[PDB]
Design a protein around this ligand. Sequence first.
Ligand SMILES: [Ca+2]
Ligand SMILES: [Mg+2]
Ligand SMILES: [Mg+2]
Length: 430
Amino acid sequence: GPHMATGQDRVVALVDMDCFFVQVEQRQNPHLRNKPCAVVQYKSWKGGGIIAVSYEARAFGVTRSMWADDAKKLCPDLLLAQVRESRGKANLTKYREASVEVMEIMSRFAVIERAAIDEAYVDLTSAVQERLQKLQGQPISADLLPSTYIEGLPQGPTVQKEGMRKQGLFQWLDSLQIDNLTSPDLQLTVGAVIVEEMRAAIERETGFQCSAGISHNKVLAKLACGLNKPNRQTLVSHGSVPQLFSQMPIRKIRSLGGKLGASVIEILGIEYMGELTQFTESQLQSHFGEKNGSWLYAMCRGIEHDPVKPRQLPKTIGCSKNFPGKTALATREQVQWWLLQLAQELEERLTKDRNDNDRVATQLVVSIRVQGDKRLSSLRRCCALTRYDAHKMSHDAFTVIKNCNTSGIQTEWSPPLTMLFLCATKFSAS
DNA sequence: ATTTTGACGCT
DNA sequence: AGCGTCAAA
Ligand SMILES: [Ca+2]
Ligand SMILES: [Mg+2]
Ligand SMILES: [Mg+2]
């Protein structure tokens, strides 16, 4: 009752760019705008692997991970943009730079946590308090929320999408208590007003559209974001959680899409997030561990305390290349040449990072995969990163992995290498 | 023969 | 430290 926390103490948004790499390429090449199109890496093997897909192309069934040759079977007029190749490998610089554009705009509004190349969490609690003080009891107009959905509405006693959106928004705003500055629902609504402004700023200043979720915590904000993509935002209130979770597959909640979620389903014999409420906290801890159990117990009630971390920059800078099938590296010269290629890209990126962000990486992580291992990485070794020099870094990586070559012949490498990975970590101020 | 990333937990 | 899990485009 009066002491039960309800996880309504914060306003958190999650902003996620729509079909991000596709929008970067469509900005650059107007011929691709408003077309079925996809972004592809490499071309010789089956036309290249698709990594991003416009919504027009998704209508034909094109998805990520599809070979372009296969996507063309579903969508013969599919347009393609290729990821840049430098030093023999795909190079994602253009997308990293576009990400910085968006992250810098979002940081004007609030502290952000960079969650991926195209998404960030925003802690809006303080901005909301400020805006409520500015508003001075003034009601919030639907015109301030032109792209907002209120999850769960309309309800109770138009057949077009925008009509339904407005009906739900009208029901929500008609029922708000705008004179109570401590009302969580009002706080979320002001949060959504701010996110409309942030999304408008992103589109105005970059050309890129995005979706967003607004709720009381990161997990619900992320879930909310996906409910009405693209180019829309969704408010998930605390009160919407029971109905929302009553038919929500467990795997849809962030962190439950893999083995742990599968085990929750198998061990407990349930399917939907809401079914978790019938277990005690101790029961959940007994199956999934102390941390996961407490997290599940609160999360299924819509409560999560994970903070929006103040971190706009990536914590690592890495470069990786697979060598599948017959292309596996089987000679020492090959291994050294590709380590050099990777180290040269890494050096370029590190030097730019040092100039932009006043920091230096101090550890180099080398990871490899040998033919015949189901795991992504077969071996990982670290060494000191003391100089931003590609030849030194490639030599040091070779030194730390050379003992993996079983082959009695110095010139031959066995078992062949199917992946090389260099990652700069452990940044210190500079 | 998706590939190329990036964060964080476990022991 | 090295390995594993989960998640982005
Ligand atoms: Ca996205
Ligand atoms: Mg994303
Ligand atoms: Mg995606």
